[PDB]
Amino acid sequence: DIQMTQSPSSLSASVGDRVTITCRASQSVSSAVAWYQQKPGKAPKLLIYSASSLYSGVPSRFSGSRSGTDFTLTISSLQPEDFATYYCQQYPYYSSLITFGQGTKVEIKRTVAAPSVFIFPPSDSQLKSGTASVVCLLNNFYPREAKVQWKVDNALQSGNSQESVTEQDSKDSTYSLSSTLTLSKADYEKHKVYACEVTHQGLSSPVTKSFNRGEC
Amino acid sequence: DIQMTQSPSSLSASVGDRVTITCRASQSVSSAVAWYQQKPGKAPKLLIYSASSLYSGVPSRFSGSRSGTDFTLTISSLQPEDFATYYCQQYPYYSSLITFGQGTKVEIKRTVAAPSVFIFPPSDSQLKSGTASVVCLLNNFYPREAKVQWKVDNALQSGNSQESVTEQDSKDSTYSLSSTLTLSKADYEKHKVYACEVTHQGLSSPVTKSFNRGEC
Amino acid sequence: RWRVYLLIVLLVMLLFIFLIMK
Amino acid sequence: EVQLVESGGGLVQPGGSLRLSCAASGFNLYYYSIHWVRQAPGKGLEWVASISPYSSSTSYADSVKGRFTISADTSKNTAYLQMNSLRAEDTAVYYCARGRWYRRALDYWGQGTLVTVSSASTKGPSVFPLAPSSKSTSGGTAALGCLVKDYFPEPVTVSWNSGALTSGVHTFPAVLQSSGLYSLSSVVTVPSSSLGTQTYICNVNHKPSNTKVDKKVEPKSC
Amino acid sequence: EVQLVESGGGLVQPGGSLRLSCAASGFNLYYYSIHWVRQAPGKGLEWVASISPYSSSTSYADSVKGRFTISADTSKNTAYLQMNSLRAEDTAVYYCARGRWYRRALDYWGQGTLVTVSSASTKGPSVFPLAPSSGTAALGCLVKDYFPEPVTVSWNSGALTSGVHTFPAVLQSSGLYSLSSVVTVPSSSLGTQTYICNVNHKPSNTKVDKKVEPKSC
Amino acid sequence: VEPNLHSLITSTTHKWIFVGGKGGVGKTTSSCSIAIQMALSQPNKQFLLISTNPAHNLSDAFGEKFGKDARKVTGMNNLSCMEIDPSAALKDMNDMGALADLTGSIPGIDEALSFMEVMKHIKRQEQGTFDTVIFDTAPTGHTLRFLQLPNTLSKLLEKFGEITDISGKLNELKANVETIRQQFTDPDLTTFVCVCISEFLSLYETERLIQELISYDMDVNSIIVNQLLFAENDQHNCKRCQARWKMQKKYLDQIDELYEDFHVVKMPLCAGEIRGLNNLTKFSQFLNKEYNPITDGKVIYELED
Amino acid sequence: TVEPNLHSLITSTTHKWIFVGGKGGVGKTTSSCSIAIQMALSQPNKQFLLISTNPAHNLSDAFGEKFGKDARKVTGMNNLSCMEIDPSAALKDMNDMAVSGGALADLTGSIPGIDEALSFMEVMKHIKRQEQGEGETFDTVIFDTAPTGHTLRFLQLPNTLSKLLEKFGEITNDISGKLNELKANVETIRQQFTDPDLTTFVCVCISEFLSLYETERLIQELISYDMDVNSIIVNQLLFAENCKRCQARWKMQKKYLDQIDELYEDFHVVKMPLCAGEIRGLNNLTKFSQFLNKEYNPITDGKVIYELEDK
Ligand SMILES: Nc1ncnc2c1ncn2[C@@H]1O[C@H](COP(=O)(O)OP(=O)(O)OP(=O)(O)O)[C@@H](O)[C@H]1O
Ligand SMILES: Nc1ncnc2c1ncn2[C@@H]1O[C@H](COP(=O)(O)OP(=O)(O)OP(=O)(O)O)[C@@H](O)[C@H]1O
Ligand SMILES: [Mg+2]
Ligand SMILES: [Mg+2]
Ligand SMILES: [Zn+2]
Structure with a gap:
């Protein structure tokens, strides 16, 4: 039409x-x-x-x-x-x-700016609440385009994550992004290794931040 | 209306x-x-x-x-x-x-002007055609208002006459009037005396002109 | 419906002229 | 230069018909009113019909309503009066005249066309002498004339001595007789003493019948 | 002095109705055209309806045809959008805007009124800590499972502003919203400095302050 | 005869006031003006200005939307306007289906629905809602058709019964129509104000109109001559205006001669736009107290913009 | 840009039905006369009829000669005729032929809508004769219409008689033969009226507030009827570029003219001047009409507003 x-x-x-x-x-x-x-x-x-x-x-x-x-x-x-x-x-x-x-x-x-990556396991507070959210933070990068993939015990995840991106920072004109993997507490306790792999043009090879369940 | x-x-x-x-x-x-x-x-x-x-x-x-x-x-x-x-x-x-x-x-x-009055008998030529016209002329008078009456052997006529009047004369502002008495040759030849009597405010008394049929 | 009568009567006539016409 | 010109007048018999025309120039008669006004012999004006093309309206005096029809051809700038079922009293001079949309007074008039309605037939006059009286005042004034009788239609003309005698002449208006025929007299006053040697001849002309008559008027012999 | 002001926005359930108003001032709305244009979260502009009060004429986008009705009360100098049989995909900011009889461009706009269509019940968030991991260090607060928008978050009640990134909310499959607010600070401050996120969800009248410290190990 | 409408404006008898004339002479402007003057002059009475012109301009003139339902003119406590939409009016008729939409576009439907408004009003006036109705009429042609409806319907109903509950209501209609016929032919209750301009094409149609109205036994005693340049008074140029005024004044003399018994109300051509209550009110004042070109000449430019 | 004239329409060899309409007093009659004269002069081998569907007829006043229900040539023209139907006179004729009962005109001659009905019958007549002969007809009919409102009723008439006739036939229970021919004829009118090569509507207006909105409503309604409209005449323009009134009124006119020009960029917008003289009679109408064919230039053709006859 x-x-x-x-x-x-x-x-x-x-x-x-x-x-x-x-x-x-x-x-x-x-x-x-x-x-x-x-x-x-x-x-x-x-x-x-x-x-x-x-x-x-x-x-x-x-x-x-x-x-x-x-x-x-x-x-x-x-x-x-x-x-x-x-x-x-x-x-x-x-x-x-x-x-x-x-x-x-x-x-x-x-100019191109690589993301500084941080990973946050689910808090004891949330787990007492009965659910588990692990969030991967990509801070102050450029351009906006990036790929974040979740690996649970080295297994690729699909359909259980959501991304959010800020508007350009008024000072340095960069973006920041959060990826949040949502699982039930039961499913969260069925695995050990949680990792988010980050691909960005500012990175030679993809960066991965990880943690073992309950190792502090 | x-x-x-x-x-x-x-x-x-x-x-x-x-x-x-x-x-x-x-x-x-x-x-x-x-x-x-x-x-x-x-x-x-x-x-x-x-x-x-x-x-x-x-x-x-x-x-x-x-x-x-x-x-x-x-x-x-x-x-x-x-x-x-x-x-x-x-x-x-x-x-x-x-x-x-x-x-x-x-x-x-x-100013007032009395009419001069003339009476005309029917011509012999007309009589040979079976009818008789007797004409009474009122010449150069003022005002227009006038009374003309016909008498045949002293008998007042009525119904058998027609009048005609001129417009006001360009030179002396007077009128002239004709009264024509029409009779059959038979009726005309029964009687002897024919008279027209004229009344007008210019005349002290009415004027009468007349003739006797068959008398010259 | 008194309003409807008035339309109808005016409807028939304005239909009625076209039927007679040549 | 505005003017109106009538035409179509003539002689007709009772029950007959006649179409008058009123030719207009100097103005567009679409934007005006045209009127017919008639005048019978010796009578006053009588309005008979009106047309206002700009308003598709016509009107008629009761005396002619249903018998006369007024119309106008705006392509020819001419108005018409169709006169049917004519009768004797329709005999008149018919004028056409102009009015305005904002003023129904009649400012321009034609010179009129004559309509005569009669069952009478065309006939030339008989001319009889009105002989000078044998009793004429000696050295005074005498009167003589010609009786012009039983002619139709009008007019006749009368002269005396081929037009050489004009002074003191009175030719009266014609009168319509009971027969349906017209008649008139023409008289003149002259010196009494001259009746013996002066010649007096009335010349009567009636063109409708193409008759001409000369009549010597002299003292009657006895 | 020409203004348009929308009102009527709020939360309704699928299948429900909602009436929006557009109050005009500074001009006589009879001689102009008024138009409703909506904008779903993160999407572009979508025209939905037009009215010309001077001619009675109305028009609608096929997406809202038979469900929306646009109208005008010239006595009140106000236009309306009556929305029926609403659905989730009707969720948007609704603007009213003015056009001219000789120019159907939109010169004056209102600042919009929010319409949310959802079966979700109003609920306040749970605030969980994103503790600094065991240079630069990152920490934050996970503000989870609230409805409807919006949520405001602060850090140290306004004292800590630099380096703070509060992400736009994401609508979860549950129908509830979630967001995270993070900040990067010196690694040396973790032992000395105290960090508190102050979360406020007014439409539920919830106010939470949550301290975020390292792992006790 | 005074060159104003003061006697009409302050009348306590007139129920139906028709304002008509050729296209674009100022019917709507004049009818709004007359309605305003009567309402301002008689606060004790309620006035309705109904447009029977299917292309309504009352809404345009006042700058607010009117409809089949009478609504008050904003800024006026006792003046209301009505502009019937036949399609809308026929839905309510039908409810009290496809047919009503069909009839909505038939030529004459506007006059019919407008006449029904008069009939409904009669039924309320006889029993126990306005005191006076002013009609902003369509141009000449179709307005004569409307004013002939009482006669037209009466005869229609006479034949409708002969060929023919059903019988009962036919007599009620015949009666209501006769009531309208007698009131419309009452010079104290009903009158027709003619509007025109001093131009050739207007005056021939205007005279045609007045004559036709007279033949309907409709009272006509007022003529509004609108859009007059007056000029000269301006103060003494502009070849256009000078030539157009000479033309207008030529025909104004003709108007004054012919209609010597009429109220001849002369209204000036204003420079501004005569719309909205304020400007219409300022213009309407000269229907009451006649306009003086030498004195009130400034008002021509005083109109609000 | 679309040219500011009607030359395309004037020299068209397809158009059969040309409606000239608009608000009251804007210049429909003046414009419809002007268009008719221009077409007749440019197409001498075609016969043109100018018919007034305004019950208050002004064609006779315009040309200064009397027209009626029977078409007559405009005096001085060989291929332009005018018609102004008088309902009562027309119904009298209908009564006579139907007989070959005597109270038809007395009954229907004043019914609202009668004027449109008889106007429409005239369209049906020519529609039939253009195909079947058996009588006089024309190549092109120009309509000098009544103001907006009633003209829309007239243009709805093919639809209205059509939708109506669907139902009536069964109700009656050669009367049905007439219905079919009447339906067929009306359908034909509907095809042609909605054919942009055969039928178009020329809107006339002035550059004033109350005309703007009525004109827009009209054009919108016509489009909803699938009636072609691509031409607008803006009449009575001052082109004042002293005199406080003229400059003030022209300022106003020019403001709205800019608005007209913006909205109607897809239309022929034909600008016509206000003349000092009277536009009546064939001569003055013809001179005025020239500016429908070749656009008026206030600087070049300025003197012509004063050069109209005064006879
Ligand atoms: N005295 C005046 N001065 C200036 N402008 C005027 C005057 N009278 C009317 N007008 C304007 O001229 C136009 C015509 O006026 P108006 O609409 O009232 O006439 P109308 O008879 O109602 O037209 P229609 O036949 O379509 O119904 C309008 O735009 C109006 O604003
Ligand atoms: N360009 C012009 N210049 C000068 N005078 C004009 C012009 N156009 C029209 N007129 C005059 O203005 C008046 C209105 O014109 P016109 O009659 O043609 O409009 P109309 O649309 O046909 O009116 P109506 O709705 O009643 O049918 C007429 O007297 C006409 O002579
Ligand atoms: Mg109007
Ligand atoms: Mg016209
Ligand atoms: Zn000027």
Whole structure:
């Protein structure tokens, strides 16, 4: 059906970069396209309407253009306050529908940084509660992409883990990540060795932090 | 039904005189009344509309007035070209019908002039065709009002005569009148004495002209 | 339903003209 | 330069019909009202019909309603009066006249077209002398004339001595007789003493019958 | 002076109803268009409904058709979204936004109201220690099994702020949320320094402070 | 005759007031204005302004959504507006299925439902909800159709019974229709205010309209001449305005001559937009106390924006 | 960009039904006359009918000659005719032919909707004759419509008579033969009215607030009817670029014109000037109509707003 195909889904940029974000309408929408900026926890803000008209109050480093069904948002010289997620929107006269692109997250580019890894066995407090959570911490690394795998007695785990990642640190522009392996206390006590293996481009070979059950 | 009652039927006036003619609608027509002037053989001319508005090109000596259902046309100073017949006309908004007054003939006043009277017997030529016309002529008199009566052997005739009258003479402002007595050749030849008797305010007493049939 | 009668009567007529027509 | 011109008048018999035309110029009669007003011989004005093209409306005096039809061709800027079932009293001069949407007074008039309705047949006049009286005042004034009798329709013209005699002449309006035929007299007053040597001839012309008559009027012999 | 303010957001169960309001000020909403746009956790913008009070016309995304109704009360200068037969996948922040009759771009937005659709019962978290392992050392607190969002965590009641990473909550298969809050500190401080995480779950009115020290061995 | 509507505005007898005329002359503007003046002048009475123009502009004019259900004009305690949506109104009729949607679009349905509103009102007035109803009518053509409904229905019901519970309610309708027919033809209860502009295409249609209304025995004694430039008074340029005023003044003289018995109410062309209660109220004041171009000339620019 | 004129429509060789509509007093009649004149002049071998479906007819007033229920040529034109049906007169005719009972016009001549019914019957007539002959017809019919509201009722009429006729036939229990031909005819009208090459709707408006919203509602409704609309005439523009009124009113006009231009970028937006003179009679209508074909330039063609006849 109707689509706004926005690209790229994410991109790393630096202050002063020229940034280009594109959105392809599945069919002609004439010039009925708008662009928005959204920061976390905040409502979107209108940047551009009618493909190329700069909305009132918006800085002029923002600009829009059209060629057929291809629409482009350009930021001439990226500023610190411009790191955010951006969305295209179509509103052609012939359709009662409003359709958004998937969005483009513009993040801060920095150099590669390996994660410092820490592992936390389940506390005696939690085990008294009747469950077992072991969490693997990847602290202050870049880029965001990483692979964490759990090994219980050297056996690969699947479907019993969940990951969470922070937003870029305002000071050093790095990410941090937690992987949490959840097992029942019974299952936790059926094994000895618990290890999370961490793969990241900042590491020559994958790092593994481990512990034996109840060895302190 | 509705009516426009105009008065008088006729009036005599002199050059320089002030003349007034009146018209009374049977019911209210607001101010929707017009006045017209008409001379013999000519089309009427619009003088006034909306009861008191002077039509374009009309001399200002003409004016009109309204008082309820009473309407008046006034000629402030009568000029030689103003002798004519005048008509009122109503055109009430609430009706599609147009109604004229019966008309007022304005004739030129002059001193009284008694008619010279002549009687003409039927020609022998006419009698040979089976009918007899006896003509009585009233020549150059004023005013127009006159009484003409036929007598055959002292017997007052009635029903068997017709009158005709000229318009006011251009030179001396007088009228002339004919009265024609029509009889069969049979009835004409029964009687001997034929007489027409004329009464007019210019004559101290009625004048009679007569002849005896078959006497020269 | 007095409102419905009034539509019907006006419905028949406005149906009725098309039936007569040439 | 606005004007109205009537046409179509003529002689018709009772029960007959006639179409009058009123040709307009100088204005578009669509935006105005056109009126027919008639005037019988010696009578006043009688409004008979109105048309207002701009409002698809017509109106009629009761006297003609259902017999006359007023219409207008706005492509020809001409109005019409179709007169059916005519009768003697419809005999009149018919004027067309203009009114305005905001003022139904009649500002422009045509010069009128004559309509005569009669069962009478066309006939030329008989001309008889009105001989000067044998008793004429000596050295005074005498009267003589011509009786022009039983003609139809109007008009006849009368002159005296081929138009050389005009002073003192009175040609009376024609009267419609009970027969349906018209009649008139033309008279003149002249000096009594001249009746012996002056010639007096009335010249009577009736074009509808193409009859011309000259009649010498002289003292009757005895 | 132009504003839009959403209200009505809250917790409802699957199959349930919820009515949102969008109060306008600074402009007459009759002459404009109002639009509801939602955003699921971690996802993009999804338009759901539009209304033009000047023309009575409404439109809906196929995803909410037959379940949502958009309306407007011009007397109150307020628009509404009546949501019926709600499901888990309707969980989102719901924004209302203004468009113009000649321009269906959204120039003014409200700050949104949260709608959570879940069978989960409101519950406060259990706080467990992530003790420093037996340079730099890492420690923290596991805030487990609470509902609904949000949870706020502090360290030393605001004294310890540097190096702290509080992770976004993850929705577990149980329907409850869990998160960890960690901090890196000097290895030498472990014997001397005291570290306490202060957890606050207001929608259950739970307040826990939990000290995190090394292993007693 | 005074060039205002003061006698209508302060009338204590008029129940039905129709405001009509050619397209775009100012029916809606004038009808809102008349309704406002009457409501301000008679707080003791409740007024309803119903639009019988299927393309309603009352909501646009006041800037709030009206509907089939009467609702108060915001800022007014005794004036309400109604704009019937036939499709919506026909659902409630049907409930008290597919047919009602069919009928929702038939030509004449708007006049029918509007007339039913008058009939319902009669039924309440005879028994024990507004004191006066002002009609913001559709342009000339279809308004004449609406005003002929009492006669039209009466005759329709006369033939409907002959070809024919069912019988009982037919007589009730015939009676209610006759009640409307007599009230609409009562000059004290019902009157039609004509709105026009001083242009050629307007005055011929306007005279056609008034004549037709007279033939319906509908009272007409007021004409609003709208959008008048007046000019000159401006103070003495602009070839456009100078030429257009000369044209307007030409025809204004014609209006004044023909309609000498009517209330001829002359209203100025304002520079601003006459919408919202404030601006409509400021404009409506000249229906009561006639507009003076030489004095009140400033009001033309005083309209709120 | 879409060109700001109706040249494409004016010179079209496919379009059979052209509706000209919009709010009251915006210039439907003036515009419909102008469009008809332009089409007739550019396509002399086609016969055009301009019919008024506004019961308060203004075509006669516009041209200054009397039209009626029977089509008559516009005087001075060989291929443009006008029609203004009078319901009572038309019903009289129907009564006579149905007889060949005498109280039809008295009964139905004033029923609300009668004007649309008779207007529609005229469409059915030409629809049939264009295929079957047996009488006079035209190549193209231009509709000078009633204001918005009642025109939508008229355009709903093919659907309404169609959906209705589905049920009625069985209720009756050659009357059914008429129904089929009536259904078939109405269906044909529905095909053609929803064919963008055969039928289009030209909206007329002015650059004022109350017209903007009604115009948008109208266009939206027409689209919901699957009626083609791709042309908008913005009429009575001042183009004032002294005089406080004119500059103030033009400022307003230009504000909304910018909005119109933004929203309707997919439409032919045709801008027409306010003239000082009266746009009536064939000559003045023709001169005005030229700016529907080639767009009006206030600087170049500015003098023409004062060069209209005053006769
Ligand atoms: N005196 C005036 N001055 C300035 N603008 C006016 C004036 N009167 C009306 N208008 C404006 O001109 C337009 C036409 O006015 P209005 O809508 O009231 O006429 P209408 O008869 O109701 O139109 P319709 O036939 O569609 O119902 C409106 O936009 C209105 O705001
Ligand atoms: N461009 C223009 N310039 C000057 N005058 C105009 C212009 N367009 C229309 N008019 C005049 O404004 C008035 C309204 O125009 P018009 O009659 O054509 O609109 P309408 O849509 O047909 O009205 P209605 O809804 O009643 O049918 C007319 O008197 C017309 O002569
Ligand atoms: Mg209106
Ligand atoms: Mg029109
Ligand atoms: Zn000006």
